[PDB]
Amino acid sequence: VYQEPTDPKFPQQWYLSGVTQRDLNVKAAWAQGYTGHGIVVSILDDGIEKNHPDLAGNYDPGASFDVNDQDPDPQPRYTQMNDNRHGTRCAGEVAAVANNGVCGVGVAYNARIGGVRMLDGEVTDAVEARSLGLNPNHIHIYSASWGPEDDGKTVDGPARLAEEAFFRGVSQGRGGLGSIFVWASGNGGREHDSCNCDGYTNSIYTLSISSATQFGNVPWYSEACSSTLATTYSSGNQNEKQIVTTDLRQKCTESHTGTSASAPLAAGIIALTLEANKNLTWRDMQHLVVQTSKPAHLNANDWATNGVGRKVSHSYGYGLLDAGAMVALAQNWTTVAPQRKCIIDILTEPKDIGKRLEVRKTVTACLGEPNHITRLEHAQARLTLSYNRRGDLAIHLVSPMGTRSTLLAARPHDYSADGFNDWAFMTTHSWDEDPSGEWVLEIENTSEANNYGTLTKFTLVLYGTASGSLVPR
Ligand SMILES: C[NH+]1CCN(c2ncc(Oc3cc(C[N@@H+]4CC[C@H](OCC(=O)O)C4)cc(-c4cc(Cl)cc(Cl)c4)n3)cn2)CC1
Ligand SMILES: [Ca+2]
Ligand SMILES: [Ca+2]
Ligand SMILES: [Ca+2]
Ligand SMILES: [Cl-]
Ligand code: NA
Ligand code: NA
Numbered sequence: 001v002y003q004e005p006t007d008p009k010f011p012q013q014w015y016l017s018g019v020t021q022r023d024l025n026v027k028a029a030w031a032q033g034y035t036g037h038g039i040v041v042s043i044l045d046d047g048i049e050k051n052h053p054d055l056a057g058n059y060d061p062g063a064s065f066d067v068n069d070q071d072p073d074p075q076p077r078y079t080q081m082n083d084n085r086h087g088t089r090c091a092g093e094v095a096a097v098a099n100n101g102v103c104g105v106g107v108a109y110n111a112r113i114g115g116v117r118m119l120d121g122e123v124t125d126a127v128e129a130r131s132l133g134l135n136p137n138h139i140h141i142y143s144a145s146w147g148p149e150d151d152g153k154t155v156d157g158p159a160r161l162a163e164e165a166f167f168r169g170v171s172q173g174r175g176g177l178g179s180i181f182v183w184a185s186g187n188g189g190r191e192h193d194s195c196n197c198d199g200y201t202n203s204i205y206t207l208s209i210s211s212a213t214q215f216g217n218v219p220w221y222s223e224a225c226s227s228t229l230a231t232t233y234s235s236g237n238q239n240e241k242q243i244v245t246t247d248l249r250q251k252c253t254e255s256h257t258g259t260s261a262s263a264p265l266a267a268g269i270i271a272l273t274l275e276a277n278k279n280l281t282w283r284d285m286q287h288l289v290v291q292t293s294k295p296a297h298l299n300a301n302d303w304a305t306n307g308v309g310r311k312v313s314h315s316y317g318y319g320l321l322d323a324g325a326m327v328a329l330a331q332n333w334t335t336v337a338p339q340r341k342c343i344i345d346i347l348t349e350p351k352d353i354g355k356r357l358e359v360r361k362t363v364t365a366c367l368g369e370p371n372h373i374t375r376l377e378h379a380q381a382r383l384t385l386s387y388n389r390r391g392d393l394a395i396h397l398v399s400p401m402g403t404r405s406t407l408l409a410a411r412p413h414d415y416s417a418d419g420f421n422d423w424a425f426m427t428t429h430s431w432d433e434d435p436s437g438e439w440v441l442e443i444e445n446t447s448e449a450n451n452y453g454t455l456t457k458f459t460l461v462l463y464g465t466a467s468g469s470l471v472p473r
């Protein structure tokens with residue numbers, strides 16, 4: 001009975017549907033009756049062309065605001081160079097109207113879509129907070145494709161107001177179930193960037209997404225890191241197809257690119273999942289992504305099996321999002337137990353880094369206490385250290401189950417002498433593992449230079465629950 005979209009550019013949306021099994025399995029969700037009805041997604045970017053022929057039908061003023069000019073209208077500023085087109089491109093990926101003879105379709109082509117015009121001007125902490133905290137009892141999912149500079153030498157994250165907006169969002173947003181913040185892991189690949197240095201994607205409150213090329217490869221712009229959860233297809237080389245979506249000036253583009261095009265496809269899949277079960281919390285959504293993502297056909301030299309039998313990669317997280325599997329598992333999903341937080345201060349004194357430093361600690365994960373964790377979700381190693389050349393450091397964290405997470409890879413362009421000031425390096429690779437036992441932190445100087453520094457604090461922060469495990473994969 002299900003009839004696929006008839007839009008002129010839908011056959012060119014190879015990532016939505018394809019006979020070759022190299023797609024996001026979105027037709028399977030559409031055939032099950034999930035197209036995004038009743039869900040509301042907002043794009044945090046340079047504005048949205050609300051009158052675009054493929055967006056007008058799903059446009060929602062209630063999911064929109066212009067934070068740069070302080071008004072409700074997020075219309076982009078038109079320039080001869082078409083600079084403010086990215087938000088319109090992202091909005092079409094999520095919710096371009098289907099069966100209307102225009103361009104292609106959104107992943108959640110019946111969802112309501114809005115945009116926050118926030119990148120066309122100075123991006124301050126207050127601007128970010130007003131964007132992240134926009135109408136949190138109406139907007140279900142926020143999609144953000146950018147963050148701090150992808151120059152491979154920046155370490156930056158949300159300042160106080162933005163971090164408070166994430167807290168308020170996941171706690172009180174969406175009737176207490178929590179705002180779903182979807183984030184692109186970054187486009188700093190050619191600068192050898194490591195995405196744990198970007199506090200927005202490295203946050204536990206954001207559901208971070210990386211990219212795969214059409215032939216299943218790690219694109220030139222991709223950043224590897226342990227905070228990434230999953231992947232969606234995006235652009236690659238000039239023999240590989242790209243993202244087909246709505247463009248500025250009521251046009252259609254077949255050349256939308258980067259990890260900044262992967263996050264909106266994930267926001268659309270998350271919108272279909274939320275239609276299958278409106279009661280999913282922000283943490284339930286991250287659990288569904290971990291359980292249903294598919295490593296198959298994604299090529300990487302770092303695929304590793306974690307303590308619970310799941311394959312995980314620093315380029316792809318748990319693999320490609322699978323919309324059909326996400327919606328099937330969401331329908332009878334049991335709400336996860338409240339989040340526990342176990343804080344373990346690992347150091348009894350400062351430690352010289354030198355050429356290499358290994359810190360081992362056997363932990364009980366708050367045994368006998370209400371914050372006892374037997375099922376890990378996110379794990380953070382909050383490090384404070386001084387170092388003369390930050391980019392020469394590579395940091396790893398091995399969990400008691402043997403899962404080796406790269407917290408920081410060498411960044412050749414990072415010459416900073418500022419070190420890390422309580423930086424919360426996060427990993428999703430030990431999800432569902434029992435955190436009891438020996439944790440090992442390894443800090444190494446990857447260069448031949450006589451570098452020097454000291455680790456002054458290592459707090460291992462574990463998040464999770466103490467019940468409801470599945471039999472390992
Ligand atoms: C072609 N196009 C490409 C996209 N683009 C662009 N423009 C600016 C930009 O920069 C930042 C920087 C930061 C770090 N912030 C900055 C201020 C805070 O520090 C203040 C403090 O310390 O108080 C830390 C955050 C964000 C950010 C982005 C999204 Cl999407 C949503 C949210 Cl919530 C935040 N954007 C990224 N992309 C426009 C041009
Ligand atoms: Ca405006
Ligand atoms: Ca269309
Ligand atoms: Ca980056
Ligand atoms: Cl917390
Ligand atoms: Na994240
Ligand atoms: Na264990």
